[PDB]
Structure 1
Amino acid sequence: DSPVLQSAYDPSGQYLCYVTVALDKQRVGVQPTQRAVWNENFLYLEDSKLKVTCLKWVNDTVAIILGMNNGEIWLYSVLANEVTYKFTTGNSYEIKDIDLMGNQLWCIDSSDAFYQFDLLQFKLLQHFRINNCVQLNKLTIVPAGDSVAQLLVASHSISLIDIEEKKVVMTFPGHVSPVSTLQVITNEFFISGAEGDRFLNVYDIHSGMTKCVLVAESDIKELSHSGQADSIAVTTEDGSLEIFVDPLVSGNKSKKSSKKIQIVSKDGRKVPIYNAFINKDLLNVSWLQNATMPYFKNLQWREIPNEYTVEISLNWNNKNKSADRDLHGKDLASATNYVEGNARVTSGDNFKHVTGTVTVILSQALQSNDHSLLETVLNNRDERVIRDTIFRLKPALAVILLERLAERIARQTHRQGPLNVWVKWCLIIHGGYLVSIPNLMSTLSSLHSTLKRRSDLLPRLLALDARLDCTINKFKTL
């Protein structure tokens, strides 16, 4: 169900008063509804059996009037966070409903008695019981100016009561269930709704006749109306809010809600609405974000479509980001470390992208790119065989041979000696063709870099040679 038992906006709807149970004791809190801080102050009811039955704001000091179940009516000053005065009826029967008009405070007892108190003198002016009015639970004051002459009460059927005669002037057929809401929308019509009923009856207060019946999609919790009786908002048990736009002006017997408002979070959870507020072109809705935390939103109900859903952000599966941390989880003051990873490391000298002879097997291996036959050819070490093989080799295959020898010399450092005679004989025999062919550094890029590394290492080798000469000569003489 709902953690909030009772709630009421003030007139002008700037603040909301609500009652919630804390462990076993009830408490009363007041929250501002406009976005532009939390109010931690609560009024705690010390007795566990003591409960709030009804509540009503007061329009010097703003206060809330709270009826209790012991028979006491407390005037609670919200700023001082204290109950200034407790009216008592003298009987231990719960206070069913209360209403105020100016200095007067009327209330109905659980034993169907009427009590009128006055605020300034702080006295019970009168109490009386009226015949045929039993099991009453709603009371409201019919506005006839500054003077109060008529009450409207409801058990399940509504009675209109003249105060000084103490008799029922007019009786209205209400609901099968007890009347839950009873309001005076204008001075010729009033509205009534009941517990577990989707219907609202609008009665003419003089004629006693039903003008219309307003129907909600679900059973009606709370009702609000604009001051002109030009719009009526109802929050229903399913948690939606329905607006009847211009209900009094006229298929004419029963009317359907003009607009419907729901609240759905981003993850898709439905958020119920309790206790909306309506005024001219403004509508304020309330819902509990945490377990017992009221949150509010203002809307312009004229501009919204007929079916409106408010999307609100809730924390569902939230990754707990930190201000001090980054996304990865490291400290923000921390420096990013140097990592190479899988970076290609290269040099600046890489200029890529810029009888008995074995010449037949060599040519076949070079055309087919055959490593085993190339090794079989390269195993031969006679200078005559190498020279005449390279001499009989075609000019075009000499470049491929130079590339393969460069790769083998680079990868295997111990073959640089034996393969250099092949390289030098290729350069000597096919020198003119190598002169004629262009892009020679790009074609012989591997050979150039392989020779560059070895040639670059020379001065360090010479220096180390000299130091080792010093040491060896010294211990040789010694």
Structure 2
Amino acid sequence: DSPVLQSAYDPSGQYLCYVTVALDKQRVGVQPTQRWNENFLYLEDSKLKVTCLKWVNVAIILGMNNGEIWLYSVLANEVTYKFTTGNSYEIKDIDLMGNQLWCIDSSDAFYQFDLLQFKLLQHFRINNCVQLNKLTIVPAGDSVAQLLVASHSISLIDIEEKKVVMTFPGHVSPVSTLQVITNEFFISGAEGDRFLNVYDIHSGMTKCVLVAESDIKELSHSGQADSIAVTTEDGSLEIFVDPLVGNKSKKSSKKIQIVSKDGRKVPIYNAFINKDLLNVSWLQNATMPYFKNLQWREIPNEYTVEISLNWNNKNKSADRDLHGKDLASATNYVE
């Protein structure tokens, strides 16, 4: 297990927000990936937990188990506003496109919010949707016309119809990622699963199934299906190059690992891949996040980053020499 309960890069990919626990209370911190900040937002209640975290375009909206969504401004280090649903059911997932903010409760009830007006526009529940652990609102024009939702299968709903449109056979386990790579192509991954299914929205057929070496915890897609970097549960980063071009099942091409000079392996918990640069993130000490930027195009297939970590470090004081003799003191005469 990892101290970082949740993490997410910003859309531009230069800042990482991560939630961790201090004693019994969760604290939310933000770090600059490109290059320390001591400021965390602390949840005053031990019960209160962060279920979701989504970057807003410098605000981050956090889904809570209390049943309300907190809009958090990093600069002021305080919650500017809290969107509270009428119910107390915990938020499973959230998504944003401009003013449009959509979320879902543990009661399978959809909600819509407006950031500019700070108002709950509409709430509804759609039959045949017994569980809802993922919500992704499809990028059509400048408005929301359909939503991708998945619990163990995957479904497509239209807002104005308030009804399902198409259903895709999903994984056995709960769906953990439901990102949309391009039009009529969205990827899906499940908890404790090494397979990523690519589905066609318009038709509904499994185009491909990308296979990772170990369980998948995060996923980042580059450009428009150019590359897909998936963080494995064992701490290694797999990159899929041109996943959309035997053909049904594809494996990763490049693998990235981190290992210390002494020999210990350091797991990777998140990664970002934009055009040709890949950002890797790992934890040092207990919870401090460290980063590294690399150009994955030139990296060999199996590449292991080596980092310097303290291990049996002989402690050298600047005021003493190797033998403990003070630097200021003069050397005595010995025949």
TM-score by length of 1: 0.70
Give distance in 2, aligned partners of 1:207 and 1:279.
Answer: 29
Give distance in 2, aligned partners of 1:227 and 1:57.
Answer: 18
Give distance in 1, aligned partners of 2:326 and 2:189.
Answer: 60
* C-alpha displacement of 1:149: 0.6
Give distance in 2, aligned partners of 1:324 and 1:113.
Answer: 66
* C-alpha displacement of 1:336: 1.7
Deviates more, 1:158-167 or 1:327-336: 327-336
Give distance in 1, aligned partners of 2:79 and 2:98.
Answer: 20
Aligned to 2:177: 181
Can you list the C-alpha shifts for 1:319-354, whole angstroms capped at 9, x where unaligned? 0111222222211222222211xxxxxxxxxxxxxx
Give distance in 1, aligned partners of 2:333 and 2:296.
Answer: 58
* C-alpha displacement of 1:29: 0.2
* C-alpha displacement of 1:31: 0.4
Give distance in 2, aligned partners of 1:124 and 1:227.
Answer: 33
- Residue number among 261, 264, 271 corresponding to 2:256 in the alignment: 261
Can you list the C-alpha shifts for 1:184-221, whole angstroms capped at 9, x where unaligned? 10012000000000000000110111100000000000
Give distance in 2, aligned partners of 1:208 and 1:152.
Answer: 13
Can you list the C-alpha shifts for 1:267-308, whole angstroms capped at 9, x where unaligned? 000100001111111000111111010000001101111000
Give distance in 2, aligned partners of 1:42 and 1:172.
Answer: 40
Aligned to 2:243: 247
- Give 3-state SS (helix, strand or coil) of 2:208's partner: strand
Would you say 1:301 and 2:299 are equivalent positions? no
* C-alpha displacement of 1:165: 0.2
- Give 3-state SS (helix, strand or coil) of 1:270's partner: coil
Give distance in 2, aligned partners of 1:2 and 1:54.
Answer: 17
Can you list the C-alpha shifts for 1:440-469, whole angstroms capped at 9, x where unaligned? xxxxxxxxxxxxxxxxxxxxxxxxxxxxxx
Give distance in 2, aligned partners of 1:4 and 1:33.
Answer: 16
Can you list the C-alpha shifts for 1:155-209, whole angstroms capped at 9, x where unaligned? 1010011100001111000000010000010012000000000000000110111
Bigger fraction of residues in helix: 1
Give distance in 2, aligned partners of 1:234 and 1:213.
Answer: 14
TM alignment of 1:3-152, pairs within 5 A: 3-35=3-35, 38-59=36-57, 62-152=58-148
Deviates more, 1:13-22 or 1:330-339: 330-339
- Give 3-state SS (helix, strand or coil) of 1:4's partner: coil
Aligned residues: 335
Give distance in 1, aligned partners of 2:100 and 2:126.
Answer: 19
Give distance in 2, aligned partners of 1:325 and 1:12.
Answer: 47
Higher RCO, Cα 8 Å, sep 6+: 2
Give distance in 1, aligned partners of 2:278 and 2:325.
Answer: 46
Give distance in 2, aligned partners of 1:332 and 1:85.
Answer: 58
* C-alpha displacement of 1:126: 0.3
Question: Structure 1 vs Structure 2: percent identity of aligned residues?
Answer: 100
Bigger fraction of residues in strand: 2
* C-alpha displacement of 1:312: 0.2
Can you list the C-alpha shifts for 1:67-111, whole angstroms capped at 9, x where unaligned? 000101000000100000000111110000000001010001100
TM-score by length of 2: 0.99
Give distance in 2, aligned partners of 1:66 and 1:117.
Answer: 14
Can you list the C-alpha shifts for 1:33-58, whole angstroms capped at 9, x where unaligned? 112xx000000000110000010001
Give distance in 2, aligned partners of 1:77 and 1:279.
Answer: 25
Would you say 1:210 and 2:234 are equivalent positions? no
* C-alpha displacement of 1:228: 2.1
- Give 3-state SS (helix, strand or coil) of 1:207's partner: coil
- Give 3-state SS (helix, strand or coil) of 1:84's partner: strand
Structure 2 segments unaligned to the other structure (5+ residues): none
Give distance in 1, aligned partners of 2:280 and 2:90.
Answer: 31
Give distance in 2, aligned partners of 1:44 and 1:177.
Answer: 32
Can you list the C-alpha shifts for 1:245-264, whole angstroms capped at 9, x where unaligned? 11011x10100001011100
TM alignment of 1:224-373, pairs within 5 A: 224-249=220-245, 251-340=246-335
Give distance in 1, aligned partners of 2:320 and 2:253.
Answer: 50
Deviates more, 1:222-231 or 1:330-339: 330-339
- Give 3-state SS (helix, strand or coil) of 1:277's partner: strand
Give distance in 1, aligned partners of 2:330 and 2:250.
Answer: 68
- Give 3-state SS (helix, strand or coil) of 2:11's partner: coil
Give distance in 2, aligned partners of 1:238 and 1:98.
Answer: 27
Give distance in 1, aligned partners of 2:217 and 2:161.
Answer: 34
* C-alpha displacement of 1:309: 0.3
Q: Say which one has the larger Rg.
A: 1
Give distance in 2, aligned partners of 1:274 and 1:227.
Answer: 21
* C-alpha displacement of 1:147: 1.1
- Give 3-state SS (helix, strand or coil) of 2:309's partner: coil
Give distance in 1, aligned partners of 2:17 and 2:6.
Answer: 8
* C-alpha displacement of 1:24: 0.5
Can you list the C-alpha shifts for 1:401-422, whole angstroms capped at 9, x where unaligned? xxxxxxxxxxxxxxxxxxxxxx
Give distance in 1, aligned partners of 2:100 and 2:275.
Answer: 28
Structure 1 segments unaligned to the other structure (5+ residues): 341-478
- Give 3-state SS (helix, strand or coil) of 2:178's partner: strand
Give distance in 2, aligned partners of 1:243 and 1:87.
Answer: 37
